[model samples]
Target: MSDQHDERRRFHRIAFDADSEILQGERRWEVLLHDVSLHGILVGQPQDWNGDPQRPFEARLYLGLDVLIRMEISLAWARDGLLGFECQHIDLDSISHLRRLVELNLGDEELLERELALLVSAHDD
Candidate 1:
């Protein structure tokens, strides 16, 4: 694995293939979600993306026909046609859905509990 892949990940990520739309003001870009975690997401770069690292946007991710989540995010990193985004704001319902998604995919209650505790503590500050 490359150093990027070997780098320590703060949260457990699952391969969550989905269509995502990034919206900022009246601008919108359609992209693909490569992976998802409670804290962040990896998205395939849109062809028209201008390399503006300071831009903050909201993403509407469509996990399925019935599952959609809207969250605020900012650019964390970008390389090899992929962009990493740190999730900034998520509604309670969205967070709950994301947690359940992770829990189901991980299938480890102990791990889920530990991670959830960490996430909750961070948010409590």
Candidate 2:
């Protein structure tokens, strides 16, 4: 298989930059979001991160001064001053916000529907 095909992602990712925070119990780290998708995010790591993988953390993404989407995530990878997170739990409001964000950026209704259906079906199973 082609490398591109082998590395295909389930959800489209947008080059997103935003102020965000990761909270793991009493420890909190301020991070800069590098990219985002429905299922995952890549963030520029804060100086205090210890490069631990699979550690659960709550991500607070600041969409605006007053708007934030909070979701539960687990560390998927950590390398080269960056951290990858797999989104585990998001509330309906946050999901809706993410869907809208993707829809606006992707600008393809049919593709959005198809990808979203695939994601939902996978969750169902």
Candidate 3:
């Protein structure tokens, strides 16, 4: 991870789906998004992508109620069945809707603390 990444705040673990077009546009795959933040995402599948490093890929985050947020993201890393992608740009409309959804769904302190404990246990040295 870089210093720029260190500044990012992962507010919660968001579950979403990803449709990836890889291999110079020769193949496509559907993956489950294990967790996500405004900055990046962790997916649960592998893909062979050959897109430009600087170019962003289109992502649609299905947030229920027929709401899908279309955003542009860049690949950060990939290993095993885990893929990390960074958000390069987001639609304002989508941002507003997502913000509302997150605010409504992610404000439970006890749940957050429990998740924190789990995270700590998994990452503890």
TM-score of each: 0.76, 0.74, 0.58
Error of 1 at 31 (Å): 0.5
Residues 28-89, candidate 3, lDDT per residue (tens digit)? 54555666665556665544444564555566666566777666677787787677787777
Q: In candidate 2, which residue ranges exceed 4 Å CA deviation?
A: 1-6, 50-54, 108-125
Off by over 4 Å in 3: 1-28, 46-55, 108-125
- Please report, in order, the local distance difference test score of every candidate based on alpha carbons: 0.80, 0.80, 0.60
- Tens-place lDDT per residue, model 2, 93-116, is 999888877877867546546655
Q: For candidate 1, lDDT tens digit of each residue in 31-120?
A: 988888777888988877754678687888887688888889998888998988999998888898898887788675465466558766
TM-score of candidate 1 against the unseen true structure: 0.76
Clashing pairs in 2: none
Report the C-alpha displacement of residue 75, candidate 2, in angstroms: 0.8
Pick out the ten consecutive residues of candidate 1 with the lowest summed lDDT.
3-12
58: Cα error in model 3, Å: 1.7
Top-down TM-score ranking:
1, 2, 3
Best of the two (1, 3) by TM-score: 1
